Design a protein around this ligand. Sequence first.
Ligand SMILES: Nc1nc2c(ncn2[C@@H]2O[C@H](COP(=O)(O)OP(=O)(O)OP(=O)(O)O)[C@@H](O)[C@H]2O)c(=O)[nH]1
Ligand SMILES: [Zn+2]
Lengths: 440, 356, 135, 42, 246, 323, 113, 62
Amino acid sequence: TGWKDIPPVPTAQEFIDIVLSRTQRRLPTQIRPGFKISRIRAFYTRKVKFTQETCSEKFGAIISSFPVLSDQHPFHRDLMNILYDADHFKVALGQISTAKNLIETISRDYVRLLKYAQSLYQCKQLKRAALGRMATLIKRLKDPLIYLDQVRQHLARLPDINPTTRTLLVAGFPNVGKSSFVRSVTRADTPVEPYAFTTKSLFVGHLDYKYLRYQVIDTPGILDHPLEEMNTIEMQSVTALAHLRAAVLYFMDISEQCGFSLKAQINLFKSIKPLFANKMVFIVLNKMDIKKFEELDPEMQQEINDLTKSGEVEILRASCATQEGVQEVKNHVCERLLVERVSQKLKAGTHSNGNIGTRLQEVMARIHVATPMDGTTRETFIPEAVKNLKKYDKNDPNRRVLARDIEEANGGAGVFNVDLRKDWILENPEWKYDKIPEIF
Amino acid sequence: GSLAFLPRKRAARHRGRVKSFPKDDPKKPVHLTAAMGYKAGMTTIVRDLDRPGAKAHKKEVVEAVTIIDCPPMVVVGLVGYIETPRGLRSLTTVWAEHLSDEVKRRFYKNWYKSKKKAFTKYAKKYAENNGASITRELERIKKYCTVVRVLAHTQIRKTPLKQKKAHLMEIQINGGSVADKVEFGRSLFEKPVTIDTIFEKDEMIDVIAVTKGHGFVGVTARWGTKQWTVARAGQMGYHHRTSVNHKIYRIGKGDDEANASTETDLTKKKITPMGGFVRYGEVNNDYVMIKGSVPGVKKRIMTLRKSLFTHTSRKALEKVELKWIDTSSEFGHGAFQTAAEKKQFMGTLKKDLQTS
Amino acid sequence: KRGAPGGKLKMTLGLPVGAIMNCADNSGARNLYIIAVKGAGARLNRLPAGGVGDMVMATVKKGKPELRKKVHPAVIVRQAKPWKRFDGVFLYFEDNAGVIVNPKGEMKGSAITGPVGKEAAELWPRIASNAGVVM
Amino acid sequence: AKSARASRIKENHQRFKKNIAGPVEAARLERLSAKLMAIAQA
Amino acid sequence: MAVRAQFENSNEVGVFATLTNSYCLVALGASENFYSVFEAELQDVIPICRTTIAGTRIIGRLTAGNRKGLLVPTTTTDQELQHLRNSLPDDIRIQRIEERLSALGNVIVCNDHTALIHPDLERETEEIIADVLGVEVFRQTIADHVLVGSYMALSNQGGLVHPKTSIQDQDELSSLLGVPLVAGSVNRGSNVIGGGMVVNDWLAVTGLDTTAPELSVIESVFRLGEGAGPGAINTSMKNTIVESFY
Amino acid sequence: LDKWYKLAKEKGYRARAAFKLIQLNKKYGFLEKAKVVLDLCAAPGSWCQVCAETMPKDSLIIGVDLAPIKPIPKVITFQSDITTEKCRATIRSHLKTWKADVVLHDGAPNVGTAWVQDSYNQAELALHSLKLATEFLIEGGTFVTKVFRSKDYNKLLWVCNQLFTKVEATKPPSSRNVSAEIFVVCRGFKAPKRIDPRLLDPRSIFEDLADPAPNNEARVYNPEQKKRKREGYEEGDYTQYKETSAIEFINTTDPIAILANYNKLSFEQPPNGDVALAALEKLPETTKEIRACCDDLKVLGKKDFRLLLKWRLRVREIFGLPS
Amino acid sequence: MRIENCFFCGRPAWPSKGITFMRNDGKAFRFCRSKCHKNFKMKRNPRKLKWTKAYRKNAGKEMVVDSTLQFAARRNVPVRYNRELWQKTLKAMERISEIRARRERVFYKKRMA
Amino acid sequence: VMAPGVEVEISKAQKDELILSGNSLEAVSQSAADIQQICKVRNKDIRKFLDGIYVSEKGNIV
RNA sequence: GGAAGUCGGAAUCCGCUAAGGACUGUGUAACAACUCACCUGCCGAAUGUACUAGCCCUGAAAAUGGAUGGCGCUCAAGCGU
RNA sequence: GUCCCUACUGAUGAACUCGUCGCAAUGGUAAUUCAGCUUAGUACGAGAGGAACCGCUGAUUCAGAUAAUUGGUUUUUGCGGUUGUCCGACCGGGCAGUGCCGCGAAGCUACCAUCUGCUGGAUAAUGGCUGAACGCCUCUAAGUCAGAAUCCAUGCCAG
Ligand SMILES: Nc1nc2c(ncn2[C@@H]2O[C@H](COP(=O)(O)OP(=O)(O)OP(=O)(O)O)[C@@H](O)[C@H]2O)c(=O)[nH]1
Ligand SMILES: [Zn+2]
């Protein structure tokens, strides 16, 4: 559902100030040398204990808010491994846990020391030593606390990707038109500017098709590296292409305004093909306004048709600056994703057991249409007024009365007094607004 | 308890004073600001509510209302006041001729054996030279005073009380120059003023009286528990209270003979309950129907005055429509509103057949 | 959003904390034991009390073991305490009964045995649609 | 919540007094002064 | 034509409204956002009435009727009965019945030609229903639910039935009724169809949080004047139904 | 303070639960001759310690417990829970083929939720302990369970009586007498061919019994009384209404039962048509008072119910029924 | 509004007068006073108490059959509002009520003959 | 309400502009500052909600 | 991946000079653009850095209402001679 | 093995001839929190979700009253029933420290019932205008605008 509910984590100096002001202001501070030594010990035992549970509640809040990578869907696990260097993430969280236990150990030791103290002065120095030792332990946490604040703000600004839902993945080279297709279909704000790496991260959009919700993921864009060495940016698109279940839309630019050769674009598609070993792959031939399919070299037609000769790969055409091809490439892909997911859902339930599943029975109860056996339709009463009636539109300047606008002119929700006699139908119109007798 | 009502002592006077009249501006029309009446009792009504935003909107609500009997006050005087660094000072009181014996009973503690000589020489200065002493004292009010008040008294013979001593009270005139309100006060002498003219229907008013006395009680009931702040025993009740924002639901005439009749129930009946108000009697005059509870016991004089400020609620701008008014017996579980429909329901009785 | 009722007029509270009231739905529970009243304040030594149309935290004492495993919200639908409505009618029911609901105001059961108080049906539309008798 | 003596609560009440409740009370005072003028002049 | 609406922040349209082929009943309260969304769909074609029944807001669960009659329980006062009589034309028969099951909208389902009643309704109520509504009366349960009005919605063109109704129960109910019947949900998976949506022969008003697939089956079962959905769309857009409600 | 807990803190053990187990062992000796011990809820350093002393040392001591207690040395202690099937298979892999000779369970739920939620959660955990005990026990084995006094304890006593041979409610010394902390022991495991599913099911065990006959004599012979219905309503029977013909009231053998339970005696003609109904209407008896009482049975008193019973005896004298 | 009649004794129950008891089967009982309600809860029969109107009808102390008592009834089919009908209805009940009283008086003289 | 001596006119020269002019710099600048302080967003994000009325040019009429 | 003084690591030179850092900040995806250091022109004669000494403010306070003894005192009715 | 003065809460009161109407120094002081409708499925948002000002209506706590209605209370010993005993029986009554039971007005009561709770000025944190110190600059120095449930008052209690 997101990770924006993580409370902010302060630096080392603010953590000391928060903890120490909390002890000063929420507990009494006046003690006297003339009091009993048991009262003197109890005053300083309370100060040391209070500082400990204040520290333990903020340390526990940081640990129990950041995501555990083990209890995660494995798309998100390599994403935050790429984004945050997951080895450093568990080291920084380990240093919070170690400092939490060391503060508890100091409080346990110095409460015992306060038990055997004899004077107010000795109780005062033991309180100060425990508080200063806790303060030096937080001061050593300065580097982990800066790191944990940067990841939290990045995690709060991370898009919500549902890996199990219907998904359209747009991948390809830089400057082919990956981001312009997303804005054309979804109303997601993805930067479109003509330089190499504009899309720095993963952008998500949503569309509606056949009264169903879909996801469109915009990726940064990958180069022709052999995947052993890549960018942090490029690998983020790689783990999106591998650990999600989508319909990959590979974008190729026939015209050479992308800054890369057609031979390089074909070769990347062949190299990253094993990442798409399960899902369907569609090739979208983009920027058709510049160069069409037919003025290309017939040798280059043979290779991309041999790409089509591979089993599940299909080649479609579009133009993201005229919008005359981007509409049906949305309809074609989303329809093919609709059929496969239904067929997978029907198979899970019609498995080889001889019995139809329980959860496939309910949908078949839902989809079934019950009709009368006689076939005689019941006769329908619809007046002739509505068959010529005009649809109400709020932007039309010639609308009807629409009593909510009577309310707005005459007051509001709590001021306007409705009249009920105006809808009364009587033999004489003067007989409304009458005081009808009731008791005689 | 509240520390605002801290001197929990008995009220200094039975009538109870206004203590604050509304702030006056000269641009308003001339009007009086307070009145007096006598508490009769309470009844039950049904009001057709018009409260937009309420769950009882355009529905029937049953509410408790209080009846205050209001015979017409008679104006007998005029008192002028001047501004001072020490406060406000009374400069001149001008009475009228032909003062009634009722208000004359007020200036005596033993009326039955006195010679009744009050205001006898004051009746002679109205015809001494031509009335020079009277006109001089009014011109002193016109040219020196900053606000003027009216002395008015109620009549006890119109009310069913064994008392005969009238209640005399000062009522402030607001809205005009000091010259204009003086010519009101002299013209209003010897004249009855009805509650139809002072107040109006659908108006929050301010009710001032002395509460029910309970004598010496302990801290269980005086404070409400399980120096001044320490709960100590003493007098509970007979305290002066000023209540705020009570709606006038009806102003009966007393002549109309269909006071409890509404536009929806066509029964010609009056406000007096069937058998009479318990421990009060019959209301034969103008009456004011006040929504809700109101301080003071039955038979006690009630002081009504105008609200000090302009209201900030839609409850004050609400037109009140009554469906029916209860007139059944206060003396028991009365199921009959008028005498006529009790004999219609019961049928012929033995005493009715023997008499006829 | 808490399950405090919105726009309910003042009426005489009849069921305090620690009262056994009947379960009127067909979820399987037989009685409900009130342990907390939703929306009711607590100043000092005052037992919170509920009326018709007030959801409370209840525990099933007798009934189906599955429903006995957890604490449940429950809206009171009947009350033997005589209370007053704005139409002047003082009224009371034969017993105290309620129905188990979720925090959103939707009841687990499908039908309500006996009548439903008018204030409970007017405030909770799901109880109003499963009420056979509304009075 | 807001106090009864809050500055913005007072400013809302002053807008109610001037614009809504003002002309209502001025109209009812014209009728009542007219009836008092009738009695005093008679 | 099916539109979404809300009486308040509540999505239960059928609880607060009653829609027939000649009149519409709307609960009276606060603003007229609920009223205007009905007026914007009925441009003074059939009369509309702001009504209270028994001093409560839940009008759709206490009354039941078709274009020939209107029925109200015994708790309605004479003022609400007269307000209903003056508002509606004389072609509507208004009757107040002394049935102990006072929630008539929960226990009676009716269209112009048939009626489903509660099994333990009285004989004097059943004969009055046939007389006033002018329809034939049957006693049935909708998937072992005796409050038929809450869990089943019906017009002369089709009906929407509780989702967990068995296929065998759908065939015998549709044959007895003469209209196509499809099980489905309203208001994001709620089983209370009658309390969630109101339907007549040419339009339907449902809750706001009903889903896009759920609004498609309301368009399909209840036909339109445009003739887009005749009820056979379900076997054509089965793929949407399969993925959405699996 | 507790004298047995103070004895443990001085010299004895970690807690007073070990004193509870030696009291059960003193009451009945089973730890002396057994070989395999399995504790479904290991008490911290107390129950495993007395298991280490009396039994042969280091002989299949399974210490599964959901609470992360300190691991007792020479006792195979697991910090995982017991209800999951994966933990059951983990138990299976650790015992190889040696099933447990004695099974022990400590029922310690979150007590405090009005003593009814806590009693069921204790009873549900006790039935879950019985499921694993019935899965793994030798013919003639011993089972030790902690239970709370309730109506579920009566059902738990019955299911141990049906499945085992020797049943004993211990209630020993060193036990908390303030609460309902009661030990039970089951011996004589019958070794059935198949474990019955609905016998171990918590729904069938904790299903409420059939309701007894309501005091119809109290509702008829003195209906001005009290004891209002604090329990709920029966399955079905909604709308709270019941009516039959007056002939079925006459023809029945229990006139008190029909009068108390039912709302109205009807004189409406059945569609087939009863000549007994038409004869009963046309009698010189049942005039006015009987017809008024038959319309509203729920508002009647002693004299009205008595007059109905004398009326049906007179019609049976007319009609010829034996009594 | 409507003047209700007491279930126990039949005197007119006006608004805010008495109490109303609702039973689990759907039936409401309106009472005019506490005396009527308390006698109902202890399950006494109003046909036997001599102050109730059920006894008087059962014992023949007021007559039930005649044309004027048939003319008043509870109406469940509303009529359209008509000012001429409502004014002429009011003159009818003035005539109806005085005809009843002059027939009530003859009925009482016949019993006392 | 403006100070006595400052006149406010709607600019029929550019979009969404008012002119506060007068003889007293104290009166003109204070009345301009009153408009800014009365249109100020509360309990929102300053970096995103940029709505308001702001002083653009200060100078002389002549 | 991109890194042009300004995400980083290390060096930090020369010319033209009146002077201008292989750059002090703003800014760009990188540039661009602005700005600082430094320099020249105009106005004008005294400035400005660090300390020291007095007087004054802060340099920590709980809990019935109260104390330069009180009123009160400000080119003193306070401080130094 | 160490019923009295005063304080407080109430009530009277001599002298000013008795009263009637008043003024107000001084002392006290009071309201509090939540929800719902509209704004609005709006601004904002990829989605999931999701406000606020103005306006309207209720509720919790506190405070001050009140008894039309509902419930409770019964020495109304008001009416009726009934146990023991007695006045010879009937009628009418007595005793059982008010025998018992039912209803029971009036009165007292109950957030177990109902009603009512009000507006000006000056400030603190802070945001500004003009403008020196200091030829830039500056909310402060002289001058000055706004702003908290705060402060002082009015409303309210005593006199
Ligand atoms: N003529 C033409 N130009 C296009 C078309 N689509 C995109 N472009 C241009 O080509 C550039 C493609 O860059 P983007 O739109 O950002 O797509 P991208 O492949 O994700 O590029 P990056 O975001 O930088 O990775 C854009 O700047 C457009 O100006 C097209 O359909 N026709
Ligand atoms: Zn009665």
